[PDB]
Design an enzyme around this catalytic site. Structure first.
Site, PDB file in Angstrom:
ATOM      1  N   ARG A  42       0.819  -1.204   0.000  1.00 51.86           N
ATOM      2  CA  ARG A  42       0.000   0.000   0.000  1.00 51.86           C
ATOM      3  C   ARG A  42       0.856   1.259   0.000  1.00 51.86           C
ATOM      4  O   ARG A  42       0.483   2.256  -0.619  1.00 51.86           O
ATOM      5  CB  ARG A  42      -0.925  -0.003   1.211  1.00 51.86           C
ATOM      6  N   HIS A  46       0.334   4.194  -2.514  1.00 45.77           N
ATOM      7  CA  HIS A  46      -0.006   5.492  -1.939  1.00 45.77           C
ATOM      8  C   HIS A  46       0.971   6.557  -2.416  1.00 45.77           C
ATOM      9  O   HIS A  46       0.571   7.626  -2.897  1.00 45.77           O
ATOM     10  CB  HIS A  46      -0.006   5.376  -0.408  1.00 45.77           C
ATOM     11  N   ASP A  54       7.821   8.756  -6.463  1.00 45.86           N
ATOM     12  CA  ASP A  54       8.981   9.493  -6.094  1.00 45.86           C
ATOM     13  C   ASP A  54       9.378   9.570  -4.616  1.00 45.86           C
ATOM     14  O   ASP A  54      10.140  10.364  -4.287  1.00 45.86           O
ATOM     15  CB  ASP A  54       8.852  10.918  -6.651  1.00 45.86           C
ATOM     16  N   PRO A 146      -8.268   8.662  -4.522  1.00 45.41           N
ATOM     17  CA  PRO A 146      -9.717   8.525  -4.386  1.00 45.41           C
ATOM     18  C   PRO A 146     -10.072   7.951  -3.026  1.00 45.41           C
ATOM     19  O   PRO A 146      -9.303   7.161  -2.453  1.00 45.41           O
ATOM     20  CB  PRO A 146     -10.087   7.550  -5.518  1.00 45.41           C
ATOM     21  N   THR A 177      -6.497  -7.897  -1.468  1.00 52.03           N
ATOM     22  CA  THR A 177      -6.487  -9.291  -1.051  1.00 52.03           C
ATOM     23  C   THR A 177      -5.689  -9.504   0.234  1.00 52.03           C
ATOM     24  O   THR A 177      -5.770 -10.590   0.813  1.00 52.03           O
ATOM     25  CB  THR A 177      -5.958 -10.155  -2.204  1.00 52.03           C
TER      26      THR A 177
HETATM   27  C1  HEM Z   1      -7.392   3.494  -6.191  1.00 54.28           C
HETATM   28  C2  HEM Z   1      -8.378   2.961  -5.442  1.00 54.28           C
HETATM   29  C3  HEM Z   1      -8.067   2.571  -3.994  1.00 54.28           C
HETATM   30  C4  HEM Z   1      -8.790   2.942  -2.939  1.00 54.28           C
HETATM   31  C5  HEM Z   1     -10.048   3.847  -2.959  1.00 54.28           C
HETATM   32  C6  HEM Z   1      -8.172   2.370  -1.773  1.00 54.28           C
HETATM   33  C7  HEM Z   1      -8.608   2.544  -0.485  1.00 54.28           C
HETATM   34  C8  HEM Z   1      -8.037   1.964   0.613  1.00 54.28           C
HETATM   35  C9  HEM Z   1      -8.478   2.151   1.978  1.00 54.28           C
HETATM   36  C10 HEM Z   1      -9.656   3.052   2.417  1.00 54.28           C
HETATM   37  C11 HEM Z   1      -7.686   1.422   2.768  1.00 54.28           C
HETATM   38  C12 HEM Z   1      -7.791   1.280   4.307  1.00 54.28           C
HETATM   39  C13 HEM Z   1      -7.204   2.460   5.073  1.00 54.28           C
HETATM   40  C14 HEM Z   1      -7.718   2.358   6.492  1.00 54.28           C
HETATM   41  O1  HEM Z   1      -8.970   2.371   6.668  1.00 54.28           O
HETATM   42  O2  HEM Z   1      -6.888   2.235   7.436  1.00 54.28           O
HETATM   43  C15 HEM Z   1      -6.733   0.725   1.930  1.00 54.28           C
HETATM   44  C16 HEM Z   1      -5.756  -0.136   2.386  1.00 54.28           C
HETATM   45  C17 HEM Z   1      -4.903  -0.855   1.580  1.00 54.28           C
HETATM   46  N1  HEM Z   1      -4.746  -0.660   0.218  1.00 54.28           N
HETATM   47 FE1  HEM Z   1      -6.005   0.413  -0.978  1.00 54.28          FE
HETATM   48  N2  HEM Z   1      -7.068   1.633  -2.163  1.00 54.28           N
HETATM   49  C18 HEM Z   1      -6.972   1.734  -3.539  1.00 54.28           C
HETATM   50  C19 HEM Z   1      -5.995   1.153  -4.313  1.00 54.28           C
HETATM   51  C20 HEM Z   1      -5.021   0.288  -3.861  1.00 54.28           C
HETATM   52  C21 HEM Z   1      -3.999  -0.303  -4.691  1.00 54.28           C
HETATM   53  C22 HEM Z   1      -3.855  -0.001  -6.201  1.00 54.28           C
HETATM   54  C23 HEM Z   1      -3.233  -1.084  -3.911  1.00 54.28           C
HETATM   55  C24 HEM Z   1      -2.022  -1.962  -4.298  1.00 54.28           C
HETATM   56  C25 HEM Z   1      -1.823  -2.475  -5.521  1.00 54.28           C
HETATM   57  C26 HEM Z   1      -3.780  -1.029  -2.570  1.00 54.28           C
HETATM   58  C27 HEM Z   1      -3.305  -1.719  -1.478  1.00 54.28           C
HETATM   59  C28 HEM Z   1      -3.779  -1.573  -0.200  1.00 54.28           C
HETATM   60  C29 HEM Z   1      -3.359  -2.354   0.943  1.00 54.28           C
HETATM   61  C30 HEM Z   1      -2.309  -3.485   0.885  1.00 54.28           C
HETATM   62  C31 HEM Z   1      -4.029  -1.919   2.010  1.00 54.28           C
HETATM   63  C32 HEM Z   1      -3.905  -2.438   3.468  1.00 54.28           C
HETATM   64  C33 HEM Z   1      -2.883  -1.555   4.188  1.00 54.28           C
HETATM   65  C34 HEM Z   1      -2.478  -2.122   5.544  1.00 54.28           C
HETATM   66  O3  HEM Z   1      -3.054  -3.133   6.016  1.00 54.28           O
HETATM   67  O4  HEM Z   1      -1.562  -1.545   6.188  1.00 54.28           O
HETATM   68  N3  HEM Z   1      -4.859  -0.170  -2.566  1.00 54.28           N
HETATM   69  N4  HEM Z   1      -6.962   1.091   0.608  1.00 54.28           N
HETATM   70 CA   LIG Z   2      -6.447 -12.846   0.213  1.00 51.91          CA
HETATM   71 NA    NA Z   3       4.890  10.455  -4.290  1.00 51.94          NA
END
Ligand code: HEM
Ligand SMILES: [Ca+2]
Ligand code: NA
Ligand SMILES: C[C@@H]1O[C@@H](O)[C@@H](O)[C@H](O)[C@@H]1O
Ligand SMILES: [Cl-]
Ligand SMILES: [Cl-]
Ligand SMILES: [Cl-]
Length: 302
Positions: A42, A46, A54, A146, A177
């Site tokens: 993430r 991010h 960067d 987003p 996942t």
């Molecule tokens: C672009 C649309 C995306 C949205 C709207 C989104 C949104 C979010 C949100 C809301 C969280 C949880 C934050 C929290 O409540 O603490 C999250 C976590 C996470 N996101 Fe996404 N995400 C997006 C794309 C991605 C992409 C492209 C990846 C990787 C290829 C990704 C990987 C992760 C991972 C691994 C977590 C878990 C982080 C952790 O457990 O420390 N996300 N995302």
């Molecule tokens: Ca899984």
């Molecule tokens: Na950056």
């Protein structure tokens, strides 16, 4: 394809052990900290979405960086991922000399290794990114990232700016996942009424964790296999068990639904696309050549 200035062999002469050093560290660290793999994956995404790939979000002065105290919980990132990037960078510094390997390259490599150690597919990572000295602001974050309340048309519009398409959207969302999500990121689907697209059994289970608005708790993004990188994320979607609106609307919207169904039916097809899309994502608005710097200390400007 590989952007101008990047190459697979970028460190062949200057730090040939770089990828093994990163991989060994991630393998060791997730033994103790299983969630670090999600954190690192993430953090790479991010960063990429906040101004470009960067390492801007690693800086102490950056919004959502390691010193962030103002942001809402879903913009307050897992602390151990910031530290792992620093520790990796330190070991590369000892082996190859300081300021040889960029923090941006470590981010991309560590994400790949996190995918692999979680059970996912390996892929080759283009290298040669330069690091940016610019602090990310709140407006950079809000402009680039987003929210989980976003639906498919808005998500595609953000991705089209940087030449990612619906298939990239569905594959890259499969990053969910693994990892965790805060109640605040999906509580709008529970209060004051249940979202009709929530599986009712799943909604009941969520309400166990988030019994009221504003609950300061996290649950798993993937109710089936929380820590295994696999296609179960899409199996969830087909059963209306995506955690975020931005997850479940992939199955609702005709632009994305058949891709979700394809990845739910075939993990192999998901894996084959995910590697391609990750390589694209890690090249968003990269600095190369003499642009930017090679940051010596990933948390601080040179
Ligand atoms: C672009 C649309 C995306 C949205 C709207 C989104 C949104 C979010 C949100 C809301 C969280 C949880 C934050 C929290 O409540 O603490 C999250 C976590 C996470 N996101 Fe996404 N995400 C997006 C794309 C991605 C992409 C492209 C990846 C990787 C290829 C990704 C990987 C992760 C991972 C691994 C977590 C878990 C982080 C952790 O457990 O420390 N996300 N995302
Ligand atoms: Ca899984
Ligand atoms: Na950056
Ligand atoms: C956490 C910080 O990182 C290291 C040192 O350079 C500082 O004194 C401080 O301990
Ligand atoms: Cl060291
Ligand atoms: Cl809260
Ligand atoms: Cl497979």
């Amino acid at each position: 394809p590989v952007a101008r200035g990047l190459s697979y062999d970028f460190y062949k002469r200057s730090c040939p052990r770089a990828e093994a050093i990163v991989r060994s560290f991630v393998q060791d660290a997730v033994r103790r900290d299983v969630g670090l793999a999600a954190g690192l994956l993430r953090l790479h995404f991010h960063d990429c979405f906040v101004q470009g790939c960067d390492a801007s979000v690693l800086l102490d002065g950056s919004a959502t960086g390691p010193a962030e105290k103002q942001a809402p919980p879903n913009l307050t990132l897992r602390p151990s991922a910031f530290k792992a990037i620093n520790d990796i960078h330190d070991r590369l510094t000892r082996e190859c000399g300081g300021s040889v390997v960029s923090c941006s390259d470590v981010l991309a490599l560590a994400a790949r290794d996190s995918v692999v150690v979680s059970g996912g597919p390996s892929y080759r990572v283009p290298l040669g990114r330069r690091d940016s000295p610019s602090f990310a602001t709140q407006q950079d974050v809000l402009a680039g990232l987003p929210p989980p309340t976003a639906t498919v048309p808005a998500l595609l519009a953000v991705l089209s700016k940087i030449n990612l398409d619906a298939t990239d959207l569905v594959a890259l969302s499969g990053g969910h996942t693994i990892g965790l999500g805060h109640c605040t990121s999906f509580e709008g689907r529970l209060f004051p009424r249940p979202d009709p697209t929530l599986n009712a059994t799943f909604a009941g289970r969520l309400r166990q964790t988030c019994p009221a608005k504003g609950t300061d708790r996290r649950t798993v993004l993937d109710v089936r296999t929380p820590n295994i990188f696999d296609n179960k994320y899409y199996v969830n979607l087909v059963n209306r068990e995506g955690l975020f609106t931005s997850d479940q609307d992939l199955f609702t919207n005709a632009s994305t639904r058949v891709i979700v169904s394809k990845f739910a039916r075939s993990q192999k097809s998901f894996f084959d696309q995910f590697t391609s899309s990750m390589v694209q994502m890690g090249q968003i608005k990269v600095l190369t050549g003499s642009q930017g710097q090679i940051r010596s200390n990933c948390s601080a400007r040179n």
